[PDB]
């Protein structure tokens, strides 16, 4: 058992210093955006909250140390820093999850990766696509094998730029923007050209 790790580190140019930590990354703020909803109401990713907790922990630990305090309180603060970084990397690993407002668990980095919600199985293994649509189906007996019925409006809003251009070079709309408004208003000309 201990071989599989000690040898792996021996061969690898990897120092088990990194397995203990003294500096922490800060993911780019947009990836943890502090975004405002329509009309002042905001929204955070709660990662900013974990960073807040760790920042305050370290700040007060310094304040004690910079001042020089009784030991046991410093021991408590140091454990608190351990806990805060633990949550940051993994909420809910040791002891209870770090629940926030209204008694709900928060989200940590290690959560962003797991299961049908983590990036792998939620946003890299499967993703949402433009130029697409969905509608109910009906039987298409009057078709041939290769042929498939298509709600014309669905086809239009699928084939939007194509019809845009095609009538633009038929000059039914001078420039592309005129054609965009044409399609939006759904003038008759867009239909034959859709065909």
């Amino acid at each position: 058992k201990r071989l599989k790790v000690v040898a792996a580190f021996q061969q690898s140019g990897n120092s088990p210093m990194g397995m203990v930590l003294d500096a922490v990354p800060v993911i780019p703020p947009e990836l943890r955006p502090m975004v405002q909803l329509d009309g002042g109401r905001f929204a955070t990713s709660d990662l900013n909250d974990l960073y807040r907790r760790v920042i305050n922990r370290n700040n007060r630990l310094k304040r004690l140390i910079d001042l020089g305090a009784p030991e046991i309180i410093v021991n408590n603060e140091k454990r608190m820093l351990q806990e805060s970084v633990d949550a940051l990397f993994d909420n809910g690993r040791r002891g209870r999850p770090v629940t926030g407002p209204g008694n709900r668990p928060l989200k940590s980095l290690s959560d962003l990766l797991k299961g049908k919600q983590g990036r792998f199985r939620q946003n890299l293994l499967g993703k949402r696509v433009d130029y697409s649509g969905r509608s109910v189906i009906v039987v298409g007996p009057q078709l041939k094998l290769h042929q498939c019925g298509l709600p014309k409006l669905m086809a239009l809003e699928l084939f939007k730029p194509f019809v845009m251009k095609r009538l633009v070079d038929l000059n039914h709309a001078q420039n592309i923007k005129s054609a965009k408004r044409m399609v939006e208003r759904q003038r008759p000309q867009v239909w034959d050209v859709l065909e």
Binding site: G13, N14, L113, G118, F120, R121, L124
Partner: protein, 49 residues
């Protein structure tokens, strides 16, 4: 490690992936899928490409 970590126990496997300096070949099928590169199957192999 990328394929397995993109299969199950995302963290546990990622641990030893990090430990063992496992450089992924960036060549596997599911690899190409994630990285947005063309997969090595069907019309993706260099012979057809």
């Amino acid at each position: 490690w990328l394929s397995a970590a993109s299969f199950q126990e995302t963290t546990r496997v990622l641990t030893d992936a990090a430990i063992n300096c496992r450089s992924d070949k960036l060549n596997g099928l599911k690899e190409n899928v994630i990285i947005g590169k063309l997969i090595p199957a069907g019309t993706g192999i260099n012979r057809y490409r």
